[PDB]
Amino acid sequence: SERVVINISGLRFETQLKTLAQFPETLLGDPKKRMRYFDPLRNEYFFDRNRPSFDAILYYYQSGGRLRRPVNVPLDIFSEEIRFYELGEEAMEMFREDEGYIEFQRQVWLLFEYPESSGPARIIAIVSVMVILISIVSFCLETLPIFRFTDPFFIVETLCIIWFSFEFLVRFFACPSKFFTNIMNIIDIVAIIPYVVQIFRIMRILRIFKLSRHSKGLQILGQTLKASMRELGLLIFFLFIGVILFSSAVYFAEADERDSQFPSIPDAFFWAVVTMTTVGYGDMTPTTIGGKIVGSLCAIAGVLTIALPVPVIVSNFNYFYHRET
Template sequence: MEGSKEKVILNIGGVRYTTYSSTLRTFPGTKLCSLTEPHAPSTYDYDPTTKEFFFDRSAEIFSYVLNYYRTKHFHCPVDTCRSVLEEELAFWEINEAQLAPCCWLKLHNREVQPEEADIWDENEQTDDQCLIVQTERRDFSWRTRWQPKIWSTFDKPFSSFSAKCVAFVSLLFIVGIVIIFCEETKAQFELFAANSTSVGYSEASHNSHEHFYHQAAYLLHLELFCVLWFTFEFSVRFCFCPDKKLFFQNPLNVVDFLSLFPVYIELFVAGQIQRMPSLGLWLGLVRIVYLLKLLKISKLIETPLILRVLCYTLKSILREICILLMILAFETLFFGSLFFYGELLGSHPSYTGELHFADILLCFWWALITLTTVGYGDIIPLTTAGQVTAALAAVFGMLTVIIPIPIFMVKFRSYYDIAIFKQKLKRRKKH
């Protein structure tokens, strides 16, 4: 206790600092910590008369170093040269990675708010880790012993060799059902084409040429085989998941659940499809959920840093995106209405042609396509007033789209710098 209250006097470039030896022991292995050892007076420049250690170093930066030992948070002055700071930290045997994110970004000429520096947390636990953790369980039943292993096998592809095999088999089934989905669209298109050509027939002719939805039986059997595997996989993962609520909060698990229904529904209403061919098309639309299962491939590869930063950036500017969409909606309504009445009122009385729109809703469609600079050309202005309106819509559309881009780039660059710093910090702490 007395040793911890022992005071140590440091003379840094002519400026005296007094602190407790317990403060200098905060970070073992550093130069300041070695000053508390018995052989320190013989190792360093020690004056027995004044009982102080002398170092001919920068007193300004040392004040921040000493504050780091007191608070365990290392900050630096704003006007410090990066090279000088690195040299001082190397002398005091302090890792640069201990520098606070806000000050690290200042040294790299990046102005960031403190709350922005905290948004990127590489140390946060993933959903998988939270689900695997078992807290204070005393039950030694077979389910308790096997639950983490089975869950890891079916949900963490890189946890074991068996998990890799299960992930590879699931990937084959996903690719297979996507191919089957593409093959099934041929029959659906043939049904639509046949019904379209029969519209011009007479009523009697149409009744004698009724078209039905005929799907190849082998495709339905293959689809059923794939879905049976998905049903087995989903059931195992759901049964052995420690937290059911957290399980369904994952969008990929919701997609897995929804993908089980289309083929079962088609088997259940097979007779109805013959009488209602459009039902087959609706079931085909529902099968698009199979394509969403391809997102599970992201679990087999590490998400690139730039994509993770992009997600954080979009979350941070969500408010600005909503405001942009509101402005775009207002411009669509305004220029669409202006175009509608400009074309009607500006038309010459002798004009006998037909306008490219029938109502104001089509003008709204034209305005949206023009504002987004797509310009299909399906609706074009024929009058002077319409052309002026189209020119204004194109200019305002460019401004609406271009102005937010610098805001997005500044945010993205800021978060990217923070992410790079966090990764460097994580690597240095491992070493």
């Protein structure tokens, strides 16, 4: 119950000794630690330090754990005062968590997993990207009407696979731990499985995801979509409810019309999709006065359905964008 006066650059703080003794590990909790700052003429402990920060420090003793940075104190200045008062590593990491902060194969694992290290590391990454870009150009040219080791496309297709196999064999016996959690390598597995044929071709387009390893923004978008599936799927659900709603509204408004462009419900789905997203079908346009109305409400409700979950998904992207800079 013994009173303790703490002078912070002229700002007076008073408390009970039992409140500071609650945490015997810190500065003000250890009598031998705070001894060097005692003023025997005023019976107080003087500190020639920042003043707005000490409101939360002394409250960390009163509350017995709570360490909230004041809204007017900078983040770096308050964090450097916690080091001086020695509140503890447990309370320091809780402050960051509350603020928002989470030989034979060692050299080959430097110019491949972290291509920003050495000199040849930054060049072998460009060559690996050129193989990917040509791998994408090769996939887009295997279908032209002109074009539809001897096969003129089997010379570059395998050449990229030889490099895409060279981007996997050097990463299995040189990785830290034996790997399937990192999605960067799951893409390397789906880019190297051309051993049902159409499903493997739709699976073959996943070689575009090979750029995510070497791209700055692709990593940011990947974290955004994962950290937004609730509001990301909320759009898909809100659009599903509206498509079923408005495709049926235009169908009953254009049912007695012998030349009504909407024959059934599912045939009016794609019309409601491009009218909500405001893309524009060009084909199925309404003809009935009531059907024309339904199209107007389908375009108005479309902008609302889209623009509601977007700011949340935009905010998740702008956070990871700035945090990675």
